[PDB]
Amino acid sequence: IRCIGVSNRDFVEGMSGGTWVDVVLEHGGCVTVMAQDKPTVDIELVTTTVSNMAEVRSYCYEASISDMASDSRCPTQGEAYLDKQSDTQYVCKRTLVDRGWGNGCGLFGKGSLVTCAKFACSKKMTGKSIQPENLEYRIMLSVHGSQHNRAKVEITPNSPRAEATLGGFGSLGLDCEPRTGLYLTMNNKHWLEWFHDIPLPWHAGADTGTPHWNNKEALVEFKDAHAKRQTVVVLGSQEGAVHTALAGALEAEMDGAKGRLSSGHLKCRLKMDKLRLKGVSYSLCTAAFTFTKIPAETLHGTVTVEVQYAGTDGPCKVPAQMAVDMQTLTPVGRLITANPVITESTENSKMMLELDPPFGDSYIVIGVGEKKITHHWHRS
Amino acid sequence: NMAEVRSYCYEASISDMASDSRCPTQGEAYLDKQSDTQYVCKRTLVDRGWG
Amino acid sequence: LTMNNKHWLVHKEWFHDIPLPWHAGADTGTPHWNNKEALVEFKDAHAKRQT
Amino acid sequence: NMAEVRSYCYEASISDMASDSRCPTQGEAYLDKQSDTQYVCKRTLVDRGWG
Amino acid sequence: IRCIGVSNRDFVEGMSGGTWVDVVLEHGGCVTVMAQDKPTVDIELVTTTVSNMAEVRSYCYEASISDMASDSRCPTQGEAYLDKQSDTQYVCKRTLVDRGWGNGCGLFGKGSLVTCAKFACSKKMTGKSIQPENLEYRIMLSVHGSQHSGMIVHETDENRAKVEITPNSPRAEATLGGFGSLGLDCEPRTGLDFSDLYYLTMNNKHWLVHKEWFHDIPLPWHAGADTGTPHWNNKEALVEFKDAHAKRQTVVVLGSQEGAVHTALAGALEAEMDGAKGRLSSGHLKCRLKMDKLRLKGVSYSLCTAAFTFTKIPAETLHGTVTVEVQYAGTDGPCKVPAQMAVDMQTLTPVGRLITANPVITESTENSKMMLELDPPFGDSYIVIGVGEKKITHHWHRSG
Amino acid sequence: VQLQESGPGLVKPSETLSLTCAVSGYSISSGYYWGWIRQPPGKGLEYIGYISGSSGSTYYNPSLKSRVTISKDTSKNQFSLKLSSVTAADTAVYYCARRDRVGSYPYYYGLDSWGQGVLVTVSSA
Amino acid sequence: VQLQESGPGLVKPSETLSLTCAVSGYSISSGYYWGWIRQPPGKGLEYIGYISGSSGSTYYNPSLKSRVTISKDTSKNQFSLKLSSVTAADTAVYYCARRDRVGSYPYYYGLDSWGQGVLVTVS
Amino acid sequence: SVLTQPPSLSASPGASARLPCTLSSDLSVGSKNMYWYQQKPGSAPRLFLYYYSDSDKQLGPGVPNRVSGSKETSSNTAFLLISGLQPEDEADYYCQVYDGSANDVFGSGTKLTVL
Amino acid sequence: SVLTQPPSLSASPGASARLPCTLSSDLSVGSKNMYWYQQKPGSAPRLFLYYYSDSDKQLGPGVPNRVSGSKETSSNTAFLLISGLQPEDEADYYCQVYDGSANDVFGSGTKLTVL
C-alpha cells in the first residue's frame, strides 16, 4: 500500500453514502481516500509527462564572430559601404573617426567608417509550446489489504474520463478536469508571456539549414571607438546569466522526447459505485498471529502493523482495533485498513494493516480470546 | 609583468555523484568524500518508513 | 561516551558541541580531524612572527 | 553492540612547523599545506620594512 | 636606527638645552628620543632575563594511585582499620555499607569500611619566585647619522651599544666613542615585577602568575623542592571516592589537569625559557638618562662637494616619516651630507623637520652607503640630497 | 530490467580483451551504475568496475591500474569493457551487473541485477 | 654558526654511509632545520633532505626515497646522515647545510650556513 | 582491506544457521552497509539480504522473513542468520561492503550445507 | 621539476651581467621565492641573493647593492643582475626554489667568466 510513508499525505473522509469523492493530487503529494462502508484506496499523481511540443522561439546565448571586415572613406567623400552590409548573417555599425593628412586624406575632419562581422551561434536555447493535446498524467491506485492488487490509471485531455480495474476489489471510476496544470531547454537541462523579451538573438521557427537570427547586435558590440578605430567584442556565453534568472522556476528534465514535469494539482471527481471489500463473506481467523516488525508511527500519527498468520484457516478476516481498557471492547480509536484479510491459505503468509489509535494511551489488540496478541501504544 | 593573485573558475563540470543515507532515529549519514578535497557535499533529510 | 576506559552517558546536544577536534562515525586509517584549531592555537607575539 | 557517532581528541600533538610570508605591498601570503586536510594554518600581519 | 621598522614606535622630545629626559621603555616597544644639540638616539628593551630562581610551591596535575586496599567489618564490630591508612602518600575514606546475613554476619545494618590507595604523582607543575637578585635587563642603543640599513646585524665598534640593568646595579653608562658616553639609571622596578607575581612552569611552557591566584589552586601540592619522594598535601584533590550506600566504594583519579589550567590561565603573561635563562616577554621599564656627555660627532665637519645617488626609492613609515638611503660618489673624508626638505625649488628654503641629527658619511672610502630619516611637512614637498648642481630631488606626499 | 551479456569465448595472451552487455529493458541515461565483476570457478568474487549512465565516470579495481577500460554506447543502450594487455592468469567467468550509488535506498547500492556469465580463458595451444 | 663535517672519504658499494655534522656555534634545540645537500663532481647540486631542530621531523628527496636516514643528538650538538646501500652513481661531494624555514624573513629560508664538504667516492 | 569468511558450515534442518563475516582491522562493522549474495554453481549470484541494523535492513525479492542479520562490534563481525533451514536454501553465500574509495570487497565463500 | 641555466656567460668589466634561470612549466616564477648561490672553486657555495620582486629582496652579507634581481613571467624565467663586474664576481651561480612538497629545486648553474 503506497502513500503510507509520505509527509505530503492527505487523508480525506468521503461522504458516508454515495459515489462522490473529490481529490486534489499534487506531484509528490499523494492522497489517502477513505470511505464509510467501502474499502480504502491510496492514490497518487506519480508522473506528468509532455509530448509533441512545438518550437516557438529559440534564443542564442553563445555567439561567435567569424568574418571581420570594414570600409572607410575620407571626409567629403560620402559614407562607407561593404557588400556584406546587407547580408542577414552579418552585423554592422558605422561611425566617424579622426583622419587627415596623416591618414591619407587631402583634408582634415571626420572619416566615415563601417564595420561588419559574420554572425554565428554556438549555443542556443529553445522554447516549446505545450498544448493540452499530447499531454498526459498518471495516477497510481493502491488498495489496502496488502503487505510489505494495485493498478495504474492514465489521463489525457483527449480522454480524461478514466476507468480503473482493481480485480476482486471491483472497479474505480474517476473524472478529472485537468484544467489546472497548464517550455525552456538550454543545456539539455529543461525548465518551465516572459521569455518573449529576453535580450538575446532569436529565431521563431524550427531549425533552418542556416538560421536567421534577429537582434544580433544585442550580443555583438561595436562600442570602443578610439577616435582612430572601432573594436568588436562578443558577449561570450550567457548560460549562467539566465540560470540565475530562474528564481523558483519550476523545473523538469527527461529524455527522449518525453519530458517528466514536477508539478501537480489535479482536481478529480471520482466515482466508486463498482468497488466492494475483498473480505466480507469471509469468516474470522481462529489461529494465532505473529508480530513480524515493531509497529511504528507515521509522520501523521497513525500506526502500521505487519503480522504473519500461522494456520491454514485462511482466507479469513483478521480482527484488529485499539485496546483502550483491555477487558471488553475493541471499538476505541479508528481502523483505517478496512477489513484486513489474509489472502493465502498457506501456513505462513505476511499481511499489513494500518490503524488510527485514539489521542491517548492504549494498546493494540489482534486475536480472539486465547492466543491473542497485544502491543502497547501512546499517541503523542 | 605582474604576479598572479587569484584565479576564479567560471565553467566547471562535476563527476562521481555518490551519496549515502541512514534511516531516521539512527543519526546522520557520512561519506569518505565529504572530508576529501576537490569535492562538494550536502547533508539533508528524506521521507523514510516501512516501504 | 568512552574515554580512557572511563565511560558515561551524556545528553543530546551537550556531546554535539564539545569544543574539541573530532571526526564522524566512520573509522579509517589516518582519520580526518575537524576543527583542529580548537586545540592548536597560534596567537600573536611581540612582532615579526607568530608562535 | 553500539556504533560510534563522534570521536573527540583531548590529547593532540603538533608537528612540522612551516611558514611562508610576503611583504605588505606584494599581497597575501600562501603555503601549499593550506590545502592539506592534516595541517592547520593561520594568516596574520607582521611588521615589515627596510630592516 | 633600531626603532625605524618598529610599529610600536614612540617619539619623545624633551626640553632643548637641558638634561631633563625621562623615557618609558616597553618590551618590543621602541623609543626614539631626539634632542636639539644632541644626536638622535634610539633605545629599546630587548630582553628581561630571569635566572637562578627558587621554588615556592609545586602542584601536581597528573597523579596515579596504586596498592588499593579495603577493610570492612560488620556492625557492632567497631570501625574498620588499615595498616597503610596512617602512611603518608595514601588516600583513605571511611564510610558505611549495607550488611546483613546475606553477606555473612549475625546482625543487620550499616557496616564499617575504609579504603586506601597509594598516591603517586606523574607530572608536576612548579611555581618559582622572581627575586630582584637576577633580572638583568638589556637595553639596546642605536644612534642616527650613519648605518645604511637594518636594525643591527653584532660587532665591537660604535653606533650600536648595549646596557645591562639589575635592581642592585641600576647605574650604567653606555659609552659611544665618537658621540660621547650616554648614561642612564633606570628604575629597575615599575617594570611589571613586584611582590605579587610568580614564575610558573608546568609542562615545558612558562607563564607569570599573580601569587594570590597561584596560592589557591585546588590541586595536590608540596612546599619546597622534594625531588625523589615528595610529601604531597591535599592528595584528595585528585582521588574522588564514589561510595553510594550499597557496597564497594570506588576510587577515581581525575585525569590530567594540564589543559584544564591552560584555559583557566588565559590572560596571564607568558615567557619562553631556554634551559635556565628563562627569557621574558613583557616590560614597563622606566628610564632616566643623562646627556651631559652626549654630543654629535660631526658638528665640526665640512660640507661635502661631490654628489650622491639614491640606492632605493624613499619609503614611508607608520608615523609619517620618510627613510632615505643615498650612496656617496667621492673620496671625501668624514664630511657632512647636505639634505633637507623644501617645497620652494631654486631657493632651497627649509620647510620640514630633521629627525636624524647631523647626517654624515663616516667611512672615507670611494662609494659608501648612508641612511637618514626625515620628518616631512604635511602635503606635497620635495626632498633634496645634494649640493647645488648635480643634486638629487625626490617628490613626497604627506597625509593627503 | 533484463541484462544481456555476450562476447567472444577466447582472447589470446597479451591482447586487448573486450566484452559487452545490453540493458534490455531500461535506459542507461537514467543514473544507475553498470559494471563488470569477474571470478574464476571456485574462487571468490572480484569486481572490475562500473560505469555511470549519466556522466560516464569510471572507477576500477586498484590492481588493474591501466589494464581495464570500461567502454560505453548510450544511444544503442549497451556498455562494454576493454581489459587491455591481458595476462595468462586472468582466466575466469565474468558477470554483467547493475548497481546504484546515488542514494537510492541503500539496498540498491549492492549489485541487485546480474547477467548470465561468460567463461573466458587465456591459452596458446 | 660553524658546521664541521665527519665521515669516511672512500666507501665501497652496498654499504650504509656514515656522516655526522657537529654544530659549533649554535644550539639545535631552538629551531633552524638542519639539512644535507650533496653535489656530483663537475655537475650541479642535488639536495638530500633535512630534519627539524625542535620536533625531529625528517623530509627527503623524491629519488632518494628509502636510502637515506637522518639522525641527531643534541648532547654533542650533532646530526648524522646514513645512506644505506650506496651505488656507483653516488660518488659526490657532500655538504652539510642549515636553514630557518620557520617564521618570517623569507631570505633566511635559503641555506645561509653551509659546510666545508666531504668528498665521497664509491668503489 | 579484505573480509574473512568461514569455508565450512553444517546444521540440522530446522535450526538457526549463523553465517559470520569478519571485516578487517581497518574497518568497523557497525558503520558499514552489509550486503549478502547467494550463489549456486551455474547461476549468477542473486542479491539475498542487505543489513546495517535491526532498524536499517532490506531483504531480497522472495526471501522469507526467517533470514535475519546481526552485528557484533566487539569481535567486528557481521552475521547472516537463517532460522528454519529448508532444503532450497543450500548454496554458497558472500558478504560485501564498499570502503573509502567505493571499492567493493567480497568474501571467501561460505559453503552452506544443511544436513 | 627542474630549473635550466646556460653553461657559459661572459661580459666586459663594468656592463651588467644578466644570469637567467628558466623554471619548468609546472611552476610560476612570478610567485616563487628565488634563491641565488655563489660558488667559487674549492670553496663552499655561499648564499648570494633572495629575490621575489624589486620590493621583496635581500642580498648576501657584505654584497654591494650593484646586484639586483628581476623576473620575466613572459618566458617564465628569473634573473640575477650584476652591474659593475669586478674581478671578484667571477664564480658559479645557482638558483634554488621550493615546490609543492617543499623540495629544493636547483638550477644547472651559470658559470660566469669575466674578462
Side-chain angles (χ1 to χ4, degrees), chain H residues 64-85:
Chain H
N65 302 274
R66 54 189 178 92
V67 176
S68 178
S70 154
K71 294 181 178 180
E72 280 189 16
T73 187
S74 62
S75 60
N76 196 86
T77 304
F79 294 157
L80 173 60
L81 311 183
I82 301 180
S83 60
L85 297 179

Side-chain angles (χ1 to χ4, degrees), chain A residues 5 7 293-294 304-306 352, chain B residues 10-11 46-51:
Chain A
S7 176
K293 306 172 64 176
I294 299 95
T304 176
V305 44
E306 193 158 36
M352 172 198 299
Chain B
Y10 60 88
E11 180 168 354
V46 285
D47 278 3
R48 308 299 301 274
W50 278 18

Side-chain angles (χ1 to χ4, degrees), chain E residues 169-180:
Chain E
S169 174
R171 267 60 181 172
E173 186 179 37
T175 171
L176 304 172
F179 298 93

